[PDB]
Amino acid sequence: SDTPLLDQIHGPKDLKRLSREQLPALTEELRGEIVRVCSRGGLHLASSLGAVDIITALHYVLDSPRDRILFDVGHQAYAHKILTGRRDQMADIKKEGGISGFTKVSESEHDAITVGHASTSLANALGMALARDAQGKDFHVAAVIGDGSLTGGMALAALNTIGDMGRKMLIVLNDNEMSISENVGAMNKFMRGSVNPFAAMGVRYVGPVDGHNVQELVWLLERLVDLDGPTILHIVTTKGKGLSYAEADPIYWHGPAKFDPATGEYVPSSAYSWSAAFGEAVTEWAKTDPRTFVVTPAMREGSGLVEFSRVHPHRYLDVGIAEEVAVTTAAGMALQGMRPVVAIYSTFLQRAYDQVLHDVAIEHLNVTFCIDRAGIVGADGATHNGVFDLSFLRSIPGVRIGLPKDAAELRGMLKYAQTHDGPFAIRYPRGNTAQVPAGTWPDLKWGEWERLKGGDDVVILAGGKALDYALKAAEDLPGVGVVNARFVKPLDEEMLREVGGRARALITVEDNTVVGGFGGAVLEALNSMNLHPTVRVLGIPDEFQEHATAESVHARAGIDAPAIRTVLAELGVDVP
Amino acid sequence: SDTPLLDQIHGPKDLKRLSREQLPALTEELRGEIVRVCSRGGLHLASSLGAVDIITALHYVLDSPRDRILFDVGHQAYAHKILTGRRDQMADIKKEGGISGFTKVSESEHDAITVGHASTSLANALGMALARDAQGKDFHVAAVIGDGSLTGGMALAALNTIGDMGRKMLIVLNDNEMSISENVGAMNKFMRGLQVQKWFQAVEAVSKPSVNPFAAMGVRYVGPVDGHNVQELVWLLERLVDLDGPTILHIVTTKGKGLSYAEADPIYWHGPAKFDPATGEYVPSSAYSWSAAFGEAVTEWAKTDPRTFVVTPAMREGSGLVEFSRVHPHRYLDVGIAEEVAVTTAAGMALQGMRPVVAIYSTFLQRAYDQVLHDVAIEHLNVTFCIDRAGIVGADGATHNGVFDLSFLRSIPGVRIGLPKDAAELRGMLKYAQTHDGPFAIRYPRGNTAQVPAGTWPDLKWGEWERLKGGDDVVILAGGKALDYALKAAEDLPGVGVVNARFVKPLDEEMLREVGGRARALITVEDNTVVGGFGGAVLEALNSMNLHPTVRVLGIPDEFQEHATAESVHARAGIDAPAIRTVLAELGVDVPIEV
Ligand SMILES: Cc1ncc(C[n+]2c([C@@](C)(O)P(=O)(O)OCCc3cn([C@H](Cc4ccccc4)C(=O)O)nn3)sc(CCOP(=O)(O)OP(=O)(O)O)c2C)c(N)n1
Ligand SMILES: Cc1ncc(C[n+]2c([C@@](C)(O)P(=O)(O)OCCc3cn([C@H](Cc4ccccc4)C(=O)O)nn3)sc(CCOP(=O)(O)OP(=O)(O)O)c2C)c(N)n1
Ligand SMILES: [Mg+2]
Ligand SMILES: [Mg+2]
Ligand code: NA
Ligand code: NA
């Protein structure tokens, strides 16, 4: 066996039987294990490699699950799961029925918080420490937060309260100068250069120290965890530590495809994502529109903006992991005559709900939202599934919402949004779509749907990913109409009145929760028109969806093509 | 006239014609004017009094509307409106048809941002500065932010970006150590030990011909300086606004400066009732608010439940928690103006076996949407939300009307939602939430309700509605404030049923199926937007049951509601008792005519 030490470790108690001089050899076994686990692709390789040493030291010094160790985001905690009885389960991580890719309270007593969104560790740790003190208990509370997660407002404000309350707790700042891209912000710049950067926070500050010296970290943790008041242990790590290819390019190896550990060669994703279609469109648009300015909250790569940032460096802003700052900064730009575009994932847009409502919508400002990862994202599970934006955006006055069926319709909606007054949201899923020629800028009327298949018996209303399911479902069913419901706000009131009054039954399909989303909008509009057709609302149930493929989630949610055909048969359609 | 200088000032241009030595006399006129404006009650007296001198200095040095002066919250900007052509309109401020109580872009070219929620000034200012630089323009950008607003995460994160971009802009930190209550947080404690610097007489001006609390932000830091020395503020602003990179000017002000009663108690005088400026005596609010009913209930509950822990984001007074904080000091937490921290801290408490209660206004709960969804709901944690100012709040207008919580909470899996009709039902819902698994939200309006005896703790079944008026022909479904309208509307209409729909999540599926299948028409009423709220929930449930009765959904339209009385907003929205009677007549009910 290549891992003699790890073979005897089934929990933190087994780990403590090792001597301190054996810990360096253990971290090497852990790194090799993490490399093999991630070699199949789609996992958080570089972040978990960087955190191996601090995780080993923390579990060697602390007594989990009696002590609580909290991970921010949780993507860097593969060594934590390997050391807490889940080594064998790492083979199926993020697979349906397997363990989560992040720490999850229901999965293990050793997982103190359920995470996926960034910057929640500090407020969670404060609550646990206050609860401990209120109950008269004495256990240790420790939080591991990266330099990227520290840019979030809810981490900075929580630290302000933590310094005020002065309770026993340890914060490990895992500083590798990386987020997904290189980290941004003034704090990141300041820390690159004997002063306590958190002196105004009233928090004890130790470091920076070598985040890969596992024996020194153990020695340090032993002399800090029992001190009075909160402490920040600032460690410096190399993202991807232990794999030369990952250290050289920590951006790609943050989430590599299937790769060969001996050569570093990986499967290039030669697909054309929706993200690349947006990036191509907005890079093209900004060439002729000097008012366009793109803001991302730390997702230049995921949103498809690498080429944009290179071609338009003076129209690009990365605010770090601060979705709230991204939206309100865009509002200020719109107030000064710009045409800002906020590129943001649906799940992360949840963080900026009040900024959309209060800072953008009240004055009806010219902010365009290009919303990636809309709908079920799949393997990242409940913390990342973007199945709520059709509900929470819809109830904001003046926020228009569109769902493009392809890249040409995306360009048409972006063009409309950038040339018309007020806020517009354009949401599209994880996945691929056909490339269109440069200069494709069709004119569309916002709010007008388009019928794609004839039929008056039963008519399916769907947009985006749900529309692909609907067209496939009605593929061989004459008389089943399909309408591209590419606008959720406003609805096509004229076509809905006509179709709702003439059809015996309607089906709405949405890659969104059924609660208050597109189906609810259709029912509200039909009621206002005093029309009462039979309607089957298909969508994600009012339940969080665990990690699986999006197709599996959609099959069990009842929105894929076979599920629609079953509903069609229930409505009396002659399905073969 | 008592105000000879102000009588000749109709804008910043007139102000600049004064000499610097006349500015102290002008601030005295402005303070007297603000006191008279606020004497009718219901206005932000102490904050605007504290900000008189910095506002006068900013308009004397800068050139609004060419330069942009941004106010965080905007409640401290009465002197700003008086100096920008709105002096006469101050008599009708926050009244329907009058000017807003906060700065508003559509109201004046001098109002750079529309505000009400705190901590938005810094990100807005950053966007304006980036837009200015992208367009090649050269105007000044200045933001005024209080020490309370600086506790918000979106202000701290924006400052981190502001230091990174390094653009020309000025941030005035208006530090009075007050939020509503005394300010909290480590930054407030740290700045208490900072000594005031004397620049204009000129010790500090000679020293540079001592620590920066924002050193890690890469921002120039000047101060703290006397925030009431208007000539020194002018002298400082002239020598700062044209420098490269961002600057924080830290000023120290006294909340309520100029009125002895307000300086002595800046908490009450943050928003005083009708008062006599010569005596300081004010009309006491002898009413019993929903806030007081919640405060009494949770203070009583925590005596027998050591797991209860109340968290507020800087709203101890408004949420009714003053007595709680005194009776249960070790079970009370104020996180500052950081709703996001309040909810996630409560999540951490629930994970360690506590029974936290988050007290929060509906409009401010919007700030914590993701923390409710991601940090509380995914693991179905024991957080109870007691939501004040639910529905239309009225005079504070669009930035404060809490008409969205029945929509954004309803689509979060596992979040139960209740609307108590009175204090006994509030206690019943609080009792249920604190003894059952998962998150619960209890929302109630600004306004009053009868006091109930101590020890009132009824048992209710969460999710069960209660019929209050007989009738199967037409049935009104409403809860909370909307229910009072419904009962008043059907008061003399036998056969018009009224159901206390006191639970929005879940609905009473059993009663809705029976009533929806037997009634020819239903009316839903909600103090909430009609988009995705209670009416939408009923339509979704009726559709799942394949029931198609006539349904009239009454609620707030899909439009922001400007400042007015709640009664005026509800009259025009169509949910008050006369509007319901009109709908009943449209549905064929024999409603007595008035002729
Ligand atoms: C509030 C908020 N805002 C943003 C984020 C996003 N984010 C985090 C993550 C885990 O969602 P993300 O990986 O981006 O997955 C976003 C969703 C996603 C998934 N796929 C996969 C491809 C794939 C990607 C990554 C790994 C494996 C496969 C696909 O589609 O095939 N593509 N995209 S992590 C981080 C930096 C932390 O920086 P630090 O705190 O310094 O930590 P450090 O790594 O340096 O140790 C950031 C910014 C967040 N959490 N929360
Ligand atoms: C995200 C967020 N969270 C919270 C707030 C609340 N808040 C602000 C306000 C203007 O809503 P609020 O007044 O509380 O009105 C809240 C709504 C409200 C209205 N009535 C009236 C009673 C009344 C109150 C006030 C004036 C007049 C009458 C009623 O019903 O009869 N009762 N309640 S102001 C501030 C401190 C800033 O501190 P600083 O930044 O340091 O400024 P400083 O004052 O020191 O100069 C805070 C915390 C906010 N903005 N944004
Ligand atoms: Mg990092
Ligand atoms: Mg203050
Ligand atoms: Na626009
Ligand atoms: Na509970």
Author numbering:
A (entry chain B): 8 to 200, 244 to 626
B (entry chain A): 8 to 208, 217 to 224, 244 to 629
Passage from the reporting paper:
1-Deoxy-d-xylulose 5-phosphate synthase (DXPS) converts pyruvate and d-glyceraldehyde 3-phosphate (d-GAP) to DXP, which is required for synthesis of essential vitamins and isoprenoids in bacterial pathogens. DXPS catalyzes the decarboxylative condensation of pyruvate and d-glyceraldehyde 3-phosphate (d-GAP) in a thiamin diphosphate (ThDP)-dependent manner to form DXP. DXP is a versatile metabolite that, depending on cellular requirements and nutrient availability, may be shuttled for use in vitamin biosynthesis (ThDP and pyridoxal phosphate) and generation of isoprenoid precursors via the methylerythritol phosphate (MEP) pathway. DXPS is active as a homodimer.
